[PDB]
């Protein structure tokens, strides 16, 4: 995604308003840029954050913030890759993982969530201890 594509997917008015909400001295921190990206429905990972940081440092001008948002687009995202990641841990091929198991996965590798973030993400999907991870991934991409 370049900025032109980005501004067909998100509303530029929101992009600007959210920048104004968080900016200081005409610039926005990467943490606040990621917060804005999420509000706009985008899903940055640490890969995207480290990329923009290498280019511009941790405090972005408006145009650099636009370039960051374009990096956050991720058109190739899909449910299948997520299900397959969880299915890796589903040895008995039940289609289920417990909340404890999913919490472990989410808080151990990659851009690890805190225990509370993981608990809150899981409890929000289901009151029950056994999670149909296929249904969970469909819901997370909703």
């Amino acid at each position: 995604a370049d900025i032109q594509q980005l501004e067909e997917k998100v509303d530029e008015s929101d992009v600007r308003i959210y920048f104004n909400e968080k900016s200081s001295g005409g610039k926005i921190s990467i943490d606040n840029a990621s917060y804005n990206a999420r509000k706009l429905g985008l899903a940055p990972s640490s890969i995207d954050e480290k990329k923009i940081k290498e280019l511009y440092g941790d405090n972005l001008t408006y145009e650099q913030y636009l370039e960051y948002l374009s990096i956050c687009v991720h058109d190739k995202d899909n449910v299948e890759e997520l299900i397959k990641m969880f299915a890796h841990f589903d040895n008995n091929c039940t289609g289920y993982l417990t909340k404890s198991q999913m919490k472990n996965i989410l808080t151990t590798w990659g851009d690890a969530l805190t225990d509370q973030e993981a608990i809150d993400a899981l409890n929000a999907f289901s009151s029950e201890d056994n999670i149909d991870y296929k249904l969970f991934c469909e819901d997370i991409l909703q």
Partner: peptide
């Protein structure tokens, strides 16, 4: 293993919680 896909999942969880 499968780290890229895990990062995408964690990214969507952070998105949804925002």
């Amino acid at each position: 293993k499968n780290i890229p896909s895990l990062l995408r999942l964690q990214a969507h969880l952070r998105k949804k919680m925002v």
